């Protein structure tokens, strides 16, 4: 047994494109420190992938908001599940740096 990825396949699967990235909720909403969130992270379509030229970088072009359910664990008795929103990247692109 052995596996290979064809060059065209490597290029396409790793070219600049929206990929599922797990992001800790703190990074987006760094509010309410004395408040536990379960899960700690959320799965977000974030940009990523090779732009295959140093001059330009994989940047988002189309973005909108997704509200997801997170279990807000109160400092003491409380387990309310709240609808925390997050930003996601619908579309990415290869555009020049700055």
């Amino acid at each position: 047994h052995h596996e290979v990825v064809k060059f065209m396949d490597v290029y396409q699967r790793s070219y600049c494109h929206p990929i599922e990235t797990l992001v800790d909720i703190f990074q987006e909403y760094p509010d309410e420190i004395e408040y536990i969130f379960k899960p700690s992270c959320v799965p977000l379509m974030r940009c990523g992938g090779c732009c295959n030229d140093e001059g330009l970088e994989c940047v988002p072009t189309e973005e909108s908001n997704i509200t997801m359910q997170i279990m807000r664990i109160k400092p003491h008795q409380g387990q309310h599940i709240g609808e925390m929103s997050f930003l996601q990247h619908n579309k990415c692109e290869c555009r020049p740096k700055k």
Partner: antibody
Amino acid sequence: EVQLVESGGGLVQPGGSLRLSCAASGFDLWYYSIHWVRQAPGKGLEWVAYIYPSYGYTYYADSVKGRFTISADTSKNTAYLQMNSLRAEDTAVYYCARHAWYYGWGLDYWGQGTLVTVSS
Amino acid sequence: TQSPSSLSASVGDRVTITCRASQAAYGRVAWYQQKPGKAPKLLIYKASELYAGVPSRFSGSRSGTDFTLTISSLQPEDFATYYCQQRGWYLFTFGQGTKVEIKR
């Protein structure tokens, strides 16, 4: 080894439907792009639509919006263009193509041409 | 638009078509070759890169909003109509088309 194979061409009276088929060999469609470009008799090219399976992208041209629908079945490695309220002007030969990033914004290996005629 | 609309040269003459991209779409232009009643083949991507197999006589350049396709040695095999594609997410803009006849 990459091939695109089309079928479904024929005649349809104005108001009718037809599904074109673009099957692919030697390369998975899922991580790629299938586009449809129609060429009217003696006229220029016209990008009809595209599908980007592993991306969830389905954008259509303005002339065909609503009337036509692009789709793809990963297992059969095959995209389909179901056109449903064909008017006369839609008569054209329809080509399908792959858009790979190694070749940038561009359509590598193309179809053969599947002819659709809208007349009563 | 494409320019010229139609043209006839002879064997060996270098020939260059120019395509307008008034919408500055980042040099996404490409060129395709349509032989008599056949499948459009691609010749130039990234407005200058060349597909594998495409003859070296084919090449492109860009004067800002003016992309040109250049054939160095027009040989009779290269008889076709050529199109330019501006591309872009949500954008195609196919060219007017340029018929390439040859004097014989």
